Symmetry: C3
């Protein structure tokens, strides 16, 4: 009716503002959306910001998601924190849900738990991962 047109009109407008919102700090891959705050924070504060925002820290589950996330890191020239950690079971990195990694892109020699105190994960401009100290300041990127 006069309602099958007020929809496609609202979809077209939303389709438009969708792109506007993602530029320049956003990346959409599938039904997931990455957005960076633009600044760096320790893991716990970064995690708190993402969760209070209604999402969680970047959790790349595929090469495609990792690639999209990587482009935000490249644009900022700042390695970013991921949501995954091996705090509970050392050596075993898991998502917020507790399940083990279904995907990984570790840099050569990582993860190494250097100094026996690396339970967090960072992603570089080259897309590779490194387990790092949670106290370090890294780019804050959330997923929605």
């Amino acid at each position: 009716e006069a309602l099958q047109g007020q929809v496609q009109h609202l979809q077209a407008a939303f389709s438009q503002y969708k792109k506007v919102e993602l530029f320049p700090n956003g990346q959409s891959v599938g039904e997931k959306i990455f957005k960076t705050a633009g600044f760096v924070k320790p893991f716990t504060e970064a995690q708190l910001l993402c969760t209070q925002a209604g999402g969680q820290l970047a959790s790349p589950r595929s090469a495609a998601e990792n690639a999209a996330l990587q482009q935000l890191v490249v644009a900022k020239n700042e390695a970013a924190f991921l949501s995954m950690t091996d705090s509970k079971t050392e050596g075993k990195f898991t998502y917020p849900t507790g399940e083990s990694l279904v995907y990984s892109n570790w840099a050569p020699g990582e993860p190494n738990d250097a100094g026996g105190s690396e339970d967090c994960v960072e992603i570089f401009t080259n897309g590779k991962w490194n387990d790092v100290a949670c106290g370090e300041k890294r780019l804050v990127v959330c997923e929605f």
Copy 2:
């Protein structure tokens, strides 16, 4: 059709969250968004109105708390929309009606120097009537 709507509602809810991060705060049906920079009142007011809204006008503790978090994140006290320019001592909204809520700091408002008709909010959420010429964080409400 009705089914293609929830899909649009779902998609919207998501981009709603994406938009508000990190410079946005939603409380009820109101939305606060900071520009991230500081400006004198008149320019701050002009930016908010031309953007289709107005300067932050917290009308409750809940709204004041949400607004406060934007100030805390920026570590920059922000301007509110309310002023007592017309009737000194009587602060009002853009509509002209008197305050329905306030969170003045101890000893405020004081109209210090007989020239404080604007209001700022601190990182602790407290208010202070301040000179309108001062540069404060720009936060609009939509």
Copy 3:
């Protein structure tokens, strides 16, 4: 009919989104990244974002775009160039300009190497070297 409720919410977030780095004029939307880049990288960022470099086709559009430049105090790149046919500036589609706001003496192709266009805080245009870093503004 729970649409008008969704339209009222979208009208709201539309405003929130555009503040402060956005400008809507007609059905077009300008948004700046806030930083400066050479033309080729600026063009790549806009296109990968789903749009293109700012392409003001009227005085109204040029005025809205100008306010983003003024707010940043940074001249911005437009999408138009005369790389194919020197002296003939065209949009990405290849069609010739339907509007222009050149500064006095402009398109001069200074040094015989100016094929890109920039817009100043006063809204005037200048053909400039594509290698220069200018504010990145896209249109959607």
